[PDB]
């Protein structure tokens, strides 16, 4: 079976309980994870250890908090106490875990299921070939020996409009924001980097990225996490918002792809 779970945010106990609920069995089943494995919840260390151990039985995409952890580890960014990353950063296997983490994709595609996953979704300004090329470029920088230079370069809110003519720092910044921070779009598809509330309580003319017709969403189902204030609600057919805010006292959601059956684990907090 194929299971897809939204942002775990260090909620190891809930993750394992949800996987036991569905009798998740590596070798017979595959797990897709929307990223943001770490931060806020208490068990980022255990989460990364487990997910790395799954190997080919897990398909991960990196989220914005995974990238932030990598930046903290590399000495690029400051550790925020509320993220609760210190046990992971101080672990004897921190190098192994984080060097594995930075090698993981930004984008997962399964052609037989016509299914795409990224942390925040797929901007309507991208077709599939462009999304793939952009994921490859940023994955290449993250898996290289020079990844701390990219992590430093990644921070920024501009440019927020895609063009194939974008080059250099702006190109990588837009790519990173589209895959890991996107929520609202302007009517022309341009990213808004500030509003993080639910679609109903957002100011006009902002609309969810998935409310703007785009070439990937026309052909593929898209699963994503990231947007906790969405509460997994209000998406169009073929769009699966899996982040139901476990670390926030919400729930951890798992979708089984074959029958579109949902399973939910209450937050322990
Ligand atoms: N149900 C919720 C959950 C979070 N939030 C807020 O949304 C902001 C972004 O958090 P998020 O969980 O959606 O995304 P990430 O920061 O994990 O990437 C936080 O500052 C939360 O306070 C909200 O307004 N409503
Ligand atoms: Mn998140
Ligand atoms: Mn996120």
Swiss-Prot record:
GO CC field: cytoplasm
Q: Name one Pfam family in it.
A: Metallophos
Q: Which terms are listed as keywords in the entry?
A: Hydrolase
What the entry lists under InterPro entries is as follows: ApaH, Calcineurin-like_PHP_ApaH, Metallo-depent_PP-like
The record's SUPFAM superfamilies line, in alphabetical order, gives: Metallo-dependent phosphatases
- According to the UniProt entry, how is activity regulated? Co(2+) is a strong stimulator (100-fold increase in rate of hydrolysis). Mn(2+), Cd(2+), Ni(2+), Mg(2+) and Ca(2+) are weak stimulators; the two latter act synergistically with Co(2+).
Q: Which GO terms describe its molecular function?
A: bis(5'-nucleosyl)-tetraphosphatase (symmetrical) activity; bis(5'-nucleosyl)-tetraphosphatase activity; hydrolase activity; phosphatase activity
Stated EC number for the protein is: 3.6.1.41
User: Does the keyword section mention Hydrolase?
Assistant: yes
Q: Does the record bear Transit peptide in its keywords? A: no
The protein's annotated catalytic reaction(s) are: P(1),P(4)-bis(5'-adenosyl) tetraphosphate + H2O = 2 ADP + 2 H(+)
**GO biological process terms held by the UniProt record:** nucleobase-containing small molecule interconversion; response to X-ray; RNA decapping
Q: Which family does it belong to?
A: Belongs to the Ap4A hydrolase family.
What role does it play? Hydrolyzes diadenosine 5',5'''-P1,P4-tetraphosphate to yield ADP.
Its quaternary structure? Monomer.
Q: What is this protein called?
A: Bis(5'-nucleosyl)-tetraphosphatase [symmetrical]
- Specify the species: Escherichia coli (strain K12)
């Amino acid at each position: 079976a194929t299971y897809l779970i939204g942002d775990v945010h260090g909620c190891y106990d809930e993750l394992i309980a949800l996987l036991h609920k569905v009798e998740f069995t590596p070798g017979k089943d595959t797990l897709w994870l929307t990223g943001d494995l770490v931060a806020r919840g208490p068990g980022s260390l255990d989460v990364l250890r487990y997910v790395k151990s799954l190997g080919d039985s897990v398909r991960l995409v990196l989220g914005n908090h995974d990238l932030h952890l990598l930046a903290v580890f590399a000495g690029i960014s400051r550790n925020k106490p509320k993220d609760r990353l210190t046990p992971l950063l101080e672990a004897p296997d921190a190098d192994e875990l984080l060097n594995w983490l930075r090698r993981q994709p930004l984008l997962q595609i399964d052609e037989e299921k016509k299914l795409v996953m990224a942390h925040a979704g797929i901007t309507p300004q991208w077709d599939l070939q462009t999304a793939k090329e952009c994921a490859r470029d940023v994955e290449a920088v993250l898996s290289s020996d020079s990844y701390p230079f990219f992590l430093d370069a990644m921070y920024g809110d501009m440019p927020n409009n895609w063009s194939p003519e974008l080059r250099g720092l702006g190109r990588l910044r837009f790519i990173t924001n589209a895959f890991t921070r996107m929520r609202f779009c302007f009517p022309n598809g341009q990213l808004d980097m500030y509003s993080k509330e639910s679609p109903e309580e957002a100011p006009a003319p902002l609309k969810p990225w998935f409310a703007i017709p785009g070439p990937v969403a026309e052909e593929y189902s898209i699963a994503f996490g990231h947007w906790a204030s969405l509460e997994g609600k209000g998406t169009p057919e073929g769009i699966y918002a899996l982040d139901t805010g476990c670390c926030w006292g919400g729930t951890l959601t798992c979708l089984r792809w074959e029958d579109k059956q949902y399973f939910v684990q209450p937050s322990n907090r």
